[PDB]
Design a protein around this nucleic acid. Structure first.
Ligand SMILES: [Zn+2]
Lengths: 231, 1042, 368
DNA sequence: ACAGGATAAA
DNA sequence: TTTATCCTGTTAGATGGTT
C-alpha cells in the first residue's frame, strides 16, 4: 500500500508482458481491419447524418450482426493490447525530458497519445519493428505537449524553434570568432532586425512567482487604480 | 603571536584551487555511453585558468563579476576505431577570491560564510524509557549519502533502519552484505548478545536476506536477489551516491578503532560489524566505550567556500555528465568532438546560483573594517545542511565547554539568531579536516616553554590534559608562580599544583573574538553589556576625521591590517611623490613602488571607503611603516569613534533612561560627522507602445527644474540635489506630440546631497544590460551627516543611547578651567547594568589627554597585582596631576571626581562628579516614516508596507486587543475599514476631510469579500443573510459584491 | 440598519457552483466555464477567450472597454459586444465573478477525505485506507453483491481478485447476475448516493440503545454526522465534486513588473490540462489503464489545488518550494484571517525613534 | 527537432 | 504582401525514476 503514484503506475505497467514481432504483425492486421470498418461507419455517418445502428452498420458490411460485432471487438482488443504492451516504451522515452516544464506523469500521459496514434498508423507490410515507428510519434507528442503546456504564458511552436535557432547561431558564432557575439552580429547572422531579437529575448523569460523571498514579492507590488488623492 | 586573521577564507580557496576542483573533475572524468563505444576522459590534473578579464576595480565600477575561465584538457576515445581527438574544453567561469578574502559578484562584494555542522562518523546515544531500561542506538552519518541507524530494543534485539523506513533486524543487513556466520561471530567480541537476535529473528541466508531487504525497502514489488543486491550497492556502496569523506573515514577509524585506508570513502563490512560490536559493548558496559555528545567541538566541523563550492561543482558535473551521455548515445555517427560534446550550462548555472542566490553566500558587512573582518570569521549553524530556526532549541544555542578558545562566548546576535551565529576566537584556526584548534605552550615541571613552538590542539585532544588559562602569571624565565593554579580537565574547572599542569593558553584574550578583544577593562564588565559593546562596535560609522582611542587595547593595529585598506611600505627607503590619489616610494637602492588610493567610494552599507596618505614628500620611510590609511583608521590602527569630554551626572531630565545630552561642539567641530553615498538607478525599457527615452523634454515641468541636466536628460556631476529634484529625465509612450508621459527619477523625500558619479551603461557600449532594458543609468549622491537629535551613540562597554538635546556650549557644565563638557551621561545606567569598565576608561582617558600619552591596556590585566586597573589609573592620574601642575585635575578624597559648574547659573553642583575622556562611536542608520495615503496591495487593497513605497504602519491584533480593552469602538472601526481597505469609504473619508464635512458610515472591507470568495472557491457555500422581518417570509441572501 | 445579520456556511452542491459561475448573455449564450488552460497572450498581453483570465467570463480587463475594441468610453454602459461578447462595464467585476470548471470524471474533496474526522469514511462506515485506495484507483469496490456468494457490499477487490471474478462471470455455466464493481471517485459517489439517511439514523439509534463502550462512541459519531446531514437537507454525495469553482482573476493576479503570477494559476492549469486530456482519452476509447491513470492525475491535481501536500506529494514550483494552494491562503500566521482581517496596515500612520521630552506634560507628545 | 502545407491576421 | 499560428507526418532499434 504505497502512497507514490508513479511507482503505482509502473507496477500497473509491469503486469503486462511485452509483445513479440509476430504478435505485432497479427495485431497490426486486426487494427487495420478495425480501421477500415471504422472508415465505413464514418461513411454511413455522412450518409445518415446520424450514428448508424449496429444493425445498419452490420448491414453495410453484408455481415451477420454477431460476426460483425465480434470482429469489431477483436479489433478493439487488438489496438488495446498494442498500446498497453508498449506503455513501457512510452515511459522509456518520456524519462528523457523530466526537467523541461511538464511533470514526469504528464510526459507519460502525453506520450501515450503518441503511442495510440502510432498504433493507429503502423504498417506491418512495411516490414519494420513497431518500436521504431512508435518512437517518432511518442517523441513528437511529448515535444508538442512541452511546447503547448510548459509555460503559463504559452509560446507558439515557431517561437520555440526560433529560440533554438538563435541559440545554435550564437554558439556557432562564439566558436567561429572565439568570443561572445554581439547583438548586431547575431541579428545580421539571423537576418532579422535587432528589435525582433530583443522581443524574442523578452518573450522567452519565465514568469517569476509572487511568493519569491525578498518577505514575499507579492507584498511589494502596488495596485492598479486611481489614488484616493487623484480623485 | 596572532597570525593572519582572515585565513579561514584563504586556506579554503587555496585548497579548492589546488586539490579541490581536481578531485571532483577526476571523480567524474571517465564518461562512457551505454553501447561502450565512446569514452570521454577529463585530464583534470591539468586544468589551466585564463587570466581574469576587466579588473577588480573595473569589475567593481562596471557592476560585473571578478572571475576567470576554466579549461580542462579532454580526450574522446573511440573504443574501436581508436581515433582520439584531444582538445581543451571550456568548463565554466569561476569567480576569484580577492586578496582580502572576498568575492565580487555582480559588482557587489560578497563573502562566503563558514558553516558549523555535525561531522561525519558514528555517534552513540542512550535513551531511557518511561518505565524501561536504558536502550542504546547508533547513527552512522556520511559526508554525503544515506544514514545508517542501529538500535537496541528492550529485549536485547538489534535493529537497522535504512533511511527513514521501518526497522529490520541486523541479521538481514549482515547476510545481505555477503558475510558468513563465522566471520561476524569472530569479529564481534560478545557473540551471545547477537546470538539472541539471531535466534529471535532466524538466521537469514544471503538470498533470503536480499529478498527481505528488497521487500522492506520497496514494498509492492516481487522480491529479487539481484534487485536487493543492486539496492544495497546503490545505497551504501556506490562511490557517486555515498561519500564518507576524508573526515568521515578519519572519525570512523578513530572511534571504532579500525585501520582502513584513508582513500576508501564508502561503507565496508568491517565498518558495520565494528559499529555493531561497539554498540554491544556499550550495552554491556565493557569499559572502553562511551556515548557521544553532538555539541562537542570535536564532533562538529566547519565548512568554508572550498567545500561548499566543491559540492556545487559536483552537482553541476553530474548534470553535465547526464547531458553528455544524452548527446553521446543519440549520435549514430562518430562526428563528435570534445568541444561539441560538453555543455557548460549546468556547471555555470550551479556556480552562479551558489554565488548569487545561496543563503551561505552573503552580502558583505562593510560598515567599518571591524565589521568586515568579523564577517569573514563568522560561523553559522544554519543553511543547506545545518539547522533551521524553528528546530534549533535551548541546547544548541548555549555555550559548550569545548568552545574554550575556539568560539567566542560573548559575540553573538540578539533575538532569533542568538547562539546560532558565532565568531571565531582570536587565536583559533581550522585544520585540514575541518575542526577548530587553538594553541598552547607546553609546561614542563611547572615551567612554561615559550622557546618551543605553540602546540595547537582540538577539542577532543585537550580533554585528558590539565590546561591552564592564559592569565596565569609566571616569573623570570618561565616558571609558574603560585601554589594553586586553575586548570581545565575533562571539560571541568578545577585547581591543581603547578607541577601537574600540561598546557597553558597563549594569551589572556585567547577565549574571545576580535571585536570583544577591543574592549579595554573588559573584566570589569558584565557579559551581556560586553556582548552589546562588541556588537555595537561593528555598527560604528567612519567619521570625517577619525581618531585613535587613548585607552586602546593593543589589537587595534592588527584589526585594521587585515581589511586591506591600510597601505604600508614594504621597502626601507624614501617617498618621492605624494598625492590625494597616488603615493610613490623609491627604494634606498632599488626600484620605485607606486600605490593608488581609493577616494570616496561606496560600501555595501552606503558608508564611505576613503583612503588618505599619511606621509609627506621627501620623507624617510622604513619597511612596515604606515603609508596610507582607511576610512576608520588613524595611523595604522582602528579608529571607530572619538575621544570627548564626558561627565557622569543627570541633567534636567535629558539623561533619562539611556538618553544622551551632548554639546554643540560636536556639531560645529565636525566631530561625529560622516559621509554617506547612496545609489539611485533608472532603467530605459521597451514597452509594447514603444521605447522609453531619456531626455529633458519632460512634460508638465518648467525650465526652473531642468537647470542641472546635461542636455541629455541626466543630472551633472557636482550638482546639489534637494528633495524631489530630478536626477534622470525619462519619458514613456503612454497610449490614449502630447503623448509622452513622465516617470523621471527623482530624489526620495528626505534626501539631499551632491552628485559624485553618473555612470551610464547601454548595450551599444558593450555592457550586459538586463533582458528587456535599453539603458541603465546609475547616479551616486553623497552627503555629510552631523550628529543630531535621534541618532544613536555608543561606547565600547555596551552603553548605548539616543541623543535627545544638543546644548549651546554656554549651557553645558564646565570644568574648573572653563572647559565645557562634550557629553553628559546618566550614572543611573552604570550600576544596574554592571559595565563598570566605562568608568575606568574615562578616567584613564582623562590622564591620557593630560599627559599627551596613549595607553595600551590589555584585558584581564589583574594577573600582575591584586587590583591592577585601579592602581594603574590612580597612578596615571596622579602623574598627570604632578606633570600638568593643576591640583584640580586629581583629588585624593574623591579620586575620579572633580568639581563642575553650571553653565546656566555659574553655581557649582553640590558634589564633585566623574569626568574623563570617553571613546564614543556613532552607529549606522533613515528610519523616520509617515503616510497619509499611498499605494495599496493587489489582493486585499490594503496599504503597502515599507519606507521606500510610502508604506503604512501595521495595526496588529495586539493593538486591536488594546483598543478593545479601552472600550474604543469608533477608533477601531475607522482603523479597520476606512483607513485600510474600505475601497469606497477611503475616498469618501478623504473627500469629507478635505471639504470639511462629516465622515460617512463605512461598509464592508475588501479583505472580507476576498475571504468569502476564497472560501466559495474552496467548495464552501458560505454566504451572508438578512433575516426576514415578518412570519411567512424566507431569509434573503445579501449580495456583498455590489 | 445593517445589511446582513448572520453568516451561514453549508456544503456546496454542483448546482450552486454552476450558479456561482454561470451567467447568461443577451445573445442567449451562457458563459462561465473555463475550457482552456491559457492565461494571457504573449504578444498582445491580452487575456484569451476561454482561459483562466477570460474577459467573456470574468469581466473586461479595462473598464468601459471591449476586448476587440469595438466599444470604448462610458457612453456604452451595459452593452455586451457582438464580435466577442464582452460586457462593457467596470473592470472591478474581475474580482467578483468566479466561473467554473466542469470535470470529465468526478473527484473527491480532499477536506472530506483526508481530515482528522473523515466524514466520507464515517458516513460510509469504512476505514480511511480503503476509501483512499478506492479513490486513487488501487482497489475495486463491490457496488452490488448481486448473486455471488462470497462477495459482500462495499468489499475491496484487488486487481487479481477482480480478474478472477471476471473469469467467473464470463463462464458459460455461471448463474451469476447483477454483480457491479467500481473504482475511483465515481464508486464513492455511488456509495454516497446509496445511503438512506432516515433508515441509517433509525438503525444506528436502535443499535446505540443496545450498545456500550467504544462501539457506542463510534456509532454516536456516525449518528451525529447522519443527523447533521438530515437537518442540513444536504446530500452526502456532494462531498464528491463534479464541477469546481474558479477564483476571480484579480484574486490570483498576473501582474507585469517580467510577469509575476500567483501559484493558483499553475494549479488551475494543471487541473484544466488533465481534465482536457481525460476528455480526449474518453473520446478516442483509450486503454482502460491510461484512462484510470488520467483520472488519478485529475484527482491529484484537484487535491493539490484545494490543499497542496495534504494527501500526496507536494507540488513544488520553479524553485523547490511548495505552491500556495487555496487552503494555505486562509490558515496560519500569514493566512488571511490573521494577516488581513484581525490586523491591517492602516493609513494616516507614522513611525519614528523616541527621545525623552522632560518639559512636556503627561498629556502631550513631541511630534516632528 | 524538422519539413511541408493551409490560412488568416497584421 | 508577408509573416504568425496551427496542423500532420517521421520507418534500424530501443520498452519500469531520482532525489
Ligand atoms: Zn467586442
Amino acid at each position: 500500500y504505497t502512497e507514490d503514484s508513479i511507482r503505482l503506475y509502473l507496477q500497473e505497467i509491469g503486469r503486462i508482458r511485452l509483445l513479440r514481432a509476430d504478435e505485432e504483425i497479427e495485431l497490426a492486421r486486426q487494427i487495420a481491419d478495425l480501421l477500415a470498418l471504422e472508415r465505413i461507419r464514418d461513411e454511413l455517418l455522412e450518409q445518415l447524418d446520424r450514428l448508424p445502428s449496429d444493425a445498419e452498420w452490420a448491414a453495410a458490411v453484408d455481415s451477420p450482426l454477431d460476426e460483425f460485432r465480434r470482429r469489431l471487438f477483436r479489433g478493439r482488443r487488438a489496438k488495446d493490447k498494442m498500446v498497453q504492451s508498449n506503455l513501457r516504451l512510452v515511459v522509456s522515452i518520456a524519462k528523457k525530458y523530466m526537467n523541461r516544464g511538464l511533470s514526469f506523469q504528464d510526459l507519460i500521459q502525453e506520450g501515450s497519445l503518441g503511442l495510440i496514434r502510432a498504433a493507429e498508423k503502423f504498417d506491418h507490410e512495411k516490414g519494420y519493428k513497431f518500436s521504431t515507428y512508435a518512437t517518432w510519434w511518442i517523441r513528437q507528442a511529448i515535444t508538442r505537449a512541452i511546447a503547448d503546456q510548459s509555460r503559463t504564458i504559452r509560446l507558439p511552436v515557431h517561437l520555440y524553434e526560433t529560440i533554438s535557432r538563435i541559440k545554435k547561431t550564437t554558439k556557432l558564432l562564439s566558436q567561429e570568432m572565439g568570443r561572445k557575439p554581439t547583438e548586431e552580429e547575431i541579428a545580421t547572422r539571423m537576418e532579422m532586425t535587432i528589435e525582433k531579437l530583443r522581443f524574442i529575448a523578452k518573450s522567452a523569460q519565465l514568469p517569476i512567482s509572487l511568493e519569491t523571498p525578498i518577505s514575499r514579492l507579492g507584498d511589494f507590488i502596488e495596485a492598479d487604480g486611481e489614488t484616493p488623492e487623484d480623485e | 603571536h596572532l597570525p593572519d586573521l582572515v585565513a579561514i577564507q584563504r586556506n579554503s580557496f587555496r585548497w579548492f584551487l589546488e586539490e579541490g576542483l581536481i578531485e571532483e573533475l577526476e571523480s567524474f572524468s571517465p564518461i562512457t555511453d551505454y553501447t561502450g563505444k565512446l569514452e570521454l576522459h577529463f585530464l583534470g590534473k591539468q586544468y589551466k585558468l585564463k587570466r581574469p578579464k576587466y579588473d577588480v576595480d573595473e569589475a567593481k565600477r562596471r557592476d560585473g563579476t571578478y572571475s576567470v575561465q576554466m579549461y580542462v584538457p579532454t580526450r574522446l576515445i573511440n573504443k574501436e576505431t581508436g581515433e582520439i581527438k584531444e582538445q581543451e574544453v571550456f568548463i565554466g567561469d569561476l569567480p576569484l577570491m580577492t586578496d582580502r578574502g572576498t568575492f565580487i559578484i555582480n559588482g557587489a562584494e560578497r563573502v562566503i560564510v563558514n558553516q558549523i555542522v555535525r561531522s561525519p562518523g558514528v555517534y552513540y546515544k542512550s535513551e531511557r524509557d518511561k518505565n524501561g531500561r536504558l536502550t542504546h542506538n547508533a547513527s552512522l552519518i556520511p559526508n554525503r549519502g544515506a544514514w545508517l541507524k542501529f538500535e537496541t530494543d528492550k529485549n536485547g534485539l538489534v535493529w537497522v533502519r535504512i533511511d527513514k523506513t521501518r526497522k529490520l533486524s541486523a541479521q538481514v543487513l549482515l547476510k545481505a552484505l555477503g558475510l558468513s556466520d563465522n566471520e561476524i561471530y569472530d569479529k564481534l567480541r560478545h557473540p551471545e548478545y547477537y546470538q539472541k537476535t539471531i535466534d529471535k529473528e532466524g538466521q537469514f541466508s544471503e538470498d533470503e536476506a536480499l529478498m527481505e531487504l528488497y521487500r522492506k525497502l520497496r514494498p509492492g514489488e516481487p522480491p529479487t536477489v539481484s534487485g536487493g543486491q543492486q539496492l544495497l550497492e546503490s545505497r551504501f556502496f556506490d562511490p557517486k551516491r555515498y561519500d564518507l569523506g576524508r573526515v568521515g573515514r578519519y572519525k570512523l577509524n578513530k572511534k571504532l578503532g579500525l585501520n582502513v585506508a584513508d582513500t576508501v570513502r564508502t561503507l565496508t563490512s568491517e565498518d558495520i560489524l565494528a559499529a555493531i560490536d561497539y554498540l554491544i559493548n556499550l550495552e554491556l558496559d565493557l569499559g572502553g566505550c562511551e556515548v557521544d555528545d553532538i555539541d562537542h567541538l570535536g564532533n562538529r566541523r566547519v565548512r568554508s567556500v572550498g567545500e561548499l563550492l566543491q559540492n556545487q561543482v559536483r552537482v553541476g558535473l553530474n548534470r553535465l555528465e547526464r547531458i553528455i551521455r544524452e548527446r553521446m548515445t543519440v549520435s549514430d555517427s562518430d562526428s563528435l568532438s570534445p568541444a561539441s560534446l560538453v555543455n557548460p550550462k549546468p556547471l555555470v548555472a550551479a556556480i552562479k546560483e551558489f554565488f548569487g542566490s545561496s543563503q551561505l553566500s552573503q552580502f558583505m558587512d562593510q560598515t567599518n573594517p571591524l565589521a568586515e573582518l568579523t564577517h569573514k570569521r563568522r560561523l553559522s549553524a544554519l543553511g543547506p545542511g545545518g539547522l533551521t530556526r524553528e528546530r534549533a532549541g535551548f541546547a544548541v544555542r548555549d555555550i559548550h565547554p569545548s568552545h574554550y578558545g575556539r568560539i567566542c562566548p560573548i559575540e553573538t546576535p540578539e533575538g532569533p539568531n542568538a547562539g546560532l551565529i558565532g565568531s571565531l576566537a582570536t587565536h583559533a584556526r581550522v585544520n585540514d579536516y575541518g575542526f577548530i584548534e587553538t594553541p598552547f605552550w607546553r609546561v614542563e615541571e611547572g615551567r612554561v616553554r615559550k622557546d618551543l613552538a605553540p602546540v595547537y590542539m582540538t577539542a577532543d585532544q585537550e580533554d585528558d590534559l590539565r590546561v591552564a588559562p592564559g592569565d596565569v602569571a609566571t616569573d623570570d624565565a618561565g616558571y609558574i608562580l603560585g601554589t594553586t593554579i586553575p586548570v581545565r580537565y575533562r571539560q571541568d574547572f578545577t585547581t591543581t599544583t603547578p607541577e601537574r599542569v600540561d598546557y597553558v593558553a597563549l594569551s589572556p584574550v585567547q577565549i574571545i573574538s576580535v571585536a570583544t578583544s577591543l574592549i579595554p577593562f573588559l573584566e570589569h564588565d558584565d557579559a551581556n553589556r560586553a556582548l552589546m559593546g562588541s556588537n555595537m562596535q561593528r555598527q560604528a560609522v567612519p567619521l570625517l576625521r577619525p581618531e585613535r582611542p587613548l585607552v586602546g587595547t593593543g589589537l587595534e593595529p592588527q584589526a585594521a591590517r587585515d581589511s586591506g585598506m591600510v597601505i604600508t611600505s614594504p621597502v626601507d627607503g624614501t617617498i618621492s611623490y605624494v598625492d590625494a590619489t597616488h603615493i610613490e616610494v623609491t627604494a634606498d637602492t632599488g626600484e620605485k613602488y607606486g600605490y593608488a588610493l581609493q577616494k570616496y567610494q561606496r560600501s555595501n552599507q552606503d558608508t564611505c571607503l576613503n583612503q588618505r596618505p599619511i606621509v609627506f614628500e621627501g620623507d624617510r620611510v622604513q619597511r612596515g611603516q604606515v603609508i596610507a590609511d582607511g576610512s576608520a583608521t588613524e595611523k595604522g590602527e582602528l579608529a571607530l569613534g572619538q575621544n570627548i569630554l564626558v561627565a557622569y551626572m543627570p541633567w534636567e531630565g535629558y539623561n533619562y533612561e539611556d538618553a544622551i545630552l551632548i554639546s554643540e561642539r560636536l556639531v560645529y567641530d565636525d566631530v561625529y560627522t560622516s559621509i554617506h553615498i547612496e545609489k539611485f538607478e533608472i532603467e530605459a525599457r521597451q514597452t509594447k507602445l514603444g521605447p522609453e527615452e531619456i531626455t529633458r523634454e519632460i512634460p508638465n515641468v518648467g525650465e526652473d527644474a531642468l537647470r542641472q541636466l546635461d542636455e541629455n536628460g541626466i543630472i551633472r556631476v557636482g550638482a546639489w540635489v534637494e528633495s524631489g529634484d530630478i536626477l534622470v529625465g525619462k519619458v514613456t509612450p503612454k497610449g490614449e506630440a502630447r503623448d509622452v508621459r513622465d516617470n523621471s527619477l527623482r530624489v526620495p523625500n528626505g534626501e539631499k546631497g551632491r552628485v559624485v558619479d553618473v555612470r551610464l551603461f547601454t548595450r551599444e557600449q558593450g555592457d550586459e544590460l538586463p533582458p528587456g532594458a535599453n539603458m541603465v543609468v546609475r547616479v551616486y549622491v553623497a552627503q555629510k551627516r552631523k550628529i543630531q537629535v535621534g541618532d544613536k551613540m555608543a561606547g565600547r562597554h555596551g552603553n548605548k543611547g539616543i541623543i535627545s538635546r544638543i546644548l549651546p556650549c554656554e549651557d553645558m557644565p564646565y570644568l574648573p578651567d572653563g572647559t565645557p563638557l562634550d557629553i553628559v551621561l546618566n550614572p543611573l545606567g552604570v550600576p544596574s547594568r554592571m559595565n563598570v569598565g566605562q568608568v575606568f576608561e574615562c578616567m584613564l582617558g582623562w590622564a591620557g589627554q593630560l599627559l599627551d600619552a596613549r595607553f595600551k591596556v590589555t584585558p584581564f590585566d589583574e594577573m600582575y597585582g591584586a587590583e591592577a586597573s585601579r592602581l594603574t589609573v590612580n597612578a596615571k592620574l596622579s602623574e598627570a596631576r604632578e606633570q600638568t601642575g593643576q591640583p584640580w585635575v586629581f583629588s585624593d578624597d574623591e579620586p575620579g571626581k572633580i568639581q563642575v559648574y553650571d553653565g546656566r547659573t555659574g553655581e557649582p553642583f553640590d558634589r564633585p562628579v566623574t569626568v574623563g575622556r570617553a571613546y564614543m562611536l556613532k552607529l549606522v542608520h533613515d528610519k523616520i516614516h509617515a503616510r497619509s495615503t499611498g499605494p495599496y496591495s493587489l489582493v486585499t487593497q490594503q496599504p503597502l508596507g515599507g519606507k521606500a513605497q510610502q508604506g503604512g504602519q501595521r495595526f496588529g491584533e495586539m493593538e486591536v486587543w488594546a483598543l478593545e480593552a479601552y472600550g474604543a469602538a469608533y477608533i477601531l472601526q475607522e482603523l479597520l475599514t476606512v483607513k485600510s481597505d474600505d475601497m469606497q469609504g477611503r475616498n469618501e473619508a478623504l473627500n469629507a476631510i478635505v471639504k470639511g464635512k462629516a465622515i460617512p458610515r463605512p461598509g464592508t472591507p475588501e479583505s472580507f469579500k476576498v475571504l468569502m470568495r476564497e472560501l466559495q472557491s474552496l467548495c464552501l457555500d458560505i454566504a451572508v443573510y438578512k433575516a426576514s422581518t415578518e412570519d411567512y417570509e424566507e431569509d434573503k441572501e445579501v449580495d456583498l459584491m455590489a | 440598519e445593517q445589511r446582513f445579520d448572520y453568516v451561514k456556511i453549508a456544503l456546496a452542491s454542483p448546482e450552486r457552483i454552476r450558479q456561482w459561475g454561470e451567467r447568461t448573455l443577451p445573445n442567449g449564450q451562457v458563459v462561465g466555464e473555463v475550457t482552456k488552460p491559457e492565461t494571457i497572450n504573449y504578444r498582445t498581453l491580452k487575456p484569451e477567450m476561454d482561459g483562466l483570465f477570460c474577459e467573456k467570463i470574468f469581466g473586461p480587463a479595462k473598464d468601459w472597454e471591449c476586448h476587440c475594441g469595438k466599444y470604448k468610453r462610458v457612453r456604452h454602459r451595459g452593452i455586451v459586444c457582438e464580435r466577442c461578447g464582452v460586457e462593457v462595464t467596470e473592470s472591478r467585476v474581475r474580482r467578483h465573478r468566479m466561473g467554473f470548471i466542469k470535470l470529465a470524471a468526478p473527484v473527491a474533496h480532499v477536506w472530506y477525505l483526508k481530515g482528522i474526522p473523515s466524514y466520507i469514511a464515517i458516513l460510509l462506515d469504512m476505514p480511511l485506507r480503503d476509501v483512499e485506495q478506492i479513490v486513487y484507483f488501487n482497489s475495486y469496490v463491490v457496488l452490488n453483491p448481486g448473486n455471488h456468494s462470497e462477495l459482500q457490499y462495499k468489499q475491496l477487490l484487488n486487481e487479481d481478485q477482480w480478474m478472477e471474478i471476471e473469469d467467473q462471470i464470463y463462464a458459460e455455466e455461471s448463474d451469476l447476475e447483477g454483480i457491479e464493481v467500481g473504482i475511483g471517485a465515481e464508486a464513492l459517489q455511488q456509495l454516497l448516493q446509496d445511503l438512506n439517511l432516515n433508515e441509517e439514523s433509525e438503525k444506528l439509534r436502535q443499535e446505540i440503545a443496545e450498545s456500550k463502550g467504544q462501539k457506542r462512541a463510534k456509532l454516536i459519531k456516525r449518528l451525529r454526522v447522519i443527523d447533521n446531514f438530515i437537518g442540513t437537507e444536504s446530500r452526502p454525495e456532494w462531498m464528491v465534486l463534479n464541477v469546481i469553482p474558479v477564483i476571480p482573476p484579480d484574486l490570483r493576479p498576473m501582474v507585469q513588473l517580467r510577469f509575476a503570477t500567483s501559484d493558483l494559476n499553475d494549479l488551475y492549469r494543471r487541473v484544466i490540462n488533465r481534465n482536457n486530456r481525460l476528455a480526449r482519452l474518453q473520446e478516442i476509447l483509450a486503454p482502460e489503464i491510461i484512462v484510470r491513470n488520467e483520472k488519478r492525475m485529475l484527482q491529484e491535481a484537484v487535491d493539490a489545488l484545494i490543499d497542496n501536500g495534504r494527501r500526496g506529494r507536494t507540488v513544488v514550483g520553479a524553485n523547490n518550494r511548495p505552491l500556495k494552494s487555496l487552503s494555505d491562503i486562509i490558515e496560519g500566521k500569514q493566512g488571511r484571517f490573521r494577516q488581513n482581517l484581525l490586523g491591517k496596515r492602516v493609513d494616516y500612520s507614522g513611525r519614528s525613534v523616541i527621545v525623552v521630552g522632560p518639559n512636556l506634560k503627561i498629556h502631550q507628545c513631541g511630534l516632528p
